[PDB]
Amino acid sequence: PQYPPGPPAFPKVYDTTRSSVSLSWGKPAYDGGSPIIGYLVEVKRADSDNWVRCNLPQNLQKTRFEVTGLMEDTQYQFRVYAVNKIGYSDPSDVPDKHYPKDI
C-alpha cells in the first residue's frame, strides 16, 4: 500500500534575475512508501487565481528550479509538489510575493 509523498520541506527563493526566480527546497519528510520521482513547480501572478505549471515532474529530480519568463516589476507566488508513482503531495507554498529583479 503506497500513498503520494509529503510536502517538500522548507521552500524558499534563493536567487532572482530581472526575468526569473530561483526556488530551492528539501526532500519531503515522507515519500508515501514509493520513491520520489520528481517535483512540480507552479507559479501564479500574486494578484491572480490561475496557477501555471512550470515543468514536467520527471524533468525535475533536483530540489531547486529556476522559474523563467517572468516579468520584472510583477509580483509572483510559487508552490512546489513532491511527486511519486502514486500521485502528488500537498503543495508547499513558497512564502510571500516576489518580484523578478536584478539584485
Residue numbers in the entry: 2 to 104
Article sentences:
Titin is a protein expressed in the skeletal and cardiac, or striated, muscle of vertebrates that plays various roles in muscle structure and function. Fn3 domains have a characteristic beta sandwich fold, with a core of hydrophobic residues as the “filling” between two beta sheets that pack against each other face-to-face.
Fn3-20 is at position 6 of the D-zone super-repeat, and Fn3-49, Fn3-56, Fn3-85 and Fn3-90 are at the 11th, 10th, 6th and 2nd position of the C-zone super-repeat, respectively. Conversely, Fn3-49 Val22232Glu and Fn3-90 Gly27849Val were insolubly expressed in bacteria and following attempts to refold the protein after purification from the insoluble fraction, were shown to be unfolded by 1D NMR. The crystal structures of the WT Fn3-20, Fn3-49 and Fn3-90 domains help rationalize these observations. Mutation to glutamic acid would introduce a charged sidechain into the core of the domain, which likely renders correct folding of the domain impossible. We see no evidence for dimerization in the crystal structures of the C-zone Fn3 domains determined here (Fn3-49, Fn3-56, Fn3-85 and Fn3-90), agreeing with these findings, and our crystal structures of Fn3 domains in the D-zone and at the end of the thick filament suggest the same organisation of titin Fn3 domains will also be found here.
